[model samples]
Target: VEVLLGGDDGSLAFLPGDFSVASGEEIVFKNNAGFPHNVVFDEDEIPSGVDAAKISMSEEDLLNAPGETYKVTLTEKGTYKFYCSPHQGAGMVGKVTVN
Candidate 1:
């Protein structure tokens, strides 16, 4: 599924509040902010309440510049919750519902 990314309060946050995708589908995270950010999932194994692993893909080192987009394919069917590596503590979180 195609998802749009933006910073919260114009400081740090992803737009649309959350995200979802189907198994084998591609999630294209586009950074609308004029800075670099990453979408990361930090679960080694799949957890309960979630369909699968917390994150099937972890993206880091994104170019903090304009017009940056990152893509990840969800191969497993499950709920994947992700957050910004830098701003996760500040509630910059998102969820991926994989079907």
Candidate 2:
């Protein structure tokens, strides 16, 4: 699955904020517009036994150009919640369920 980091109007959000996939699948997060954005998982909200750090993007990994992407492969079967580090308060959050 692909989640767009931002849109043409400069809005800070993840397009199609929620989705689901099978275990072992990958979610590709692409920064199409917004610069300096990153995908960070909420550590405490992810399924137990799943390490959020293993699936999160750091500030140093921020996407500053179009087409730049961050990929996360989910190996556990449960719900994972995440957000854009710089825009979480702007409601730039998302959820992914692996089954």
Candidate 3:
């Protein structure tokens, strides 16, 4: 699974915005639009059993070059909420439901 950040399509939002995956599946956050962005999980907004700390990414870790990506493997069966650190205030949010 993959999500694009700061795309050339003139959007700062996460493509799809919402999606689902199974346990152990990996989701990649891809950067290709030359914008400074990062994926950060909302620690207090995720499902009760989901360990946000274990899945969250740091701002520095997600500051990748164009075409680079950050991958996260889901292990818990629940919903995870995240956003782009730099464009979050512009409503660049996403949700992942793991089953």
List the candidate numbers ranked by TM-score, top first.
Answer: 2, 3, 1
Residue 8 of model 1: what lDDT? 40
**What is the lDDT for 63 in model 1?**
48
TM-score of each: 0.72, 0.93, 0.87
RMSD score of candidate 3 (Å): 1.6
Q: Write the per-residue lDDT of candidate 2 for residues 1-99, one digit (tens) a residue.
A: 888989878788788788989998778888888667898889988998987777787657788888988887998888888988888888889888889
Model 1 agreement with the true structure over 64-92: per-residue lDDT tens digits? 76657778776666666677776777777
**1-99 in candidate 3: lDDT tens per residue?**
888877676588777689999999889888867467788899888877776767777657656568778799987788888988878888988999989
Ordering by lDDT: 2, 3, 1
Best candidate, lDDT: 2
Best by TM-score: 2
Residue pairs with backbone atoms closer than 3 Å in model 3 (clashes): none
Candidate 3 structure lDDT: 0.81
User: How high is the lDDT of residue 89 in model 1?
Assistant: 79
Candidate 1 — which residues are off by over 4 angstroms?
7-11, 44-60
- lDDT by candidate, in order shown: 0.64, 0.85, 0.81
Query: RMSDs, each prediction?
Result: 4.0, 1.1, 1.6
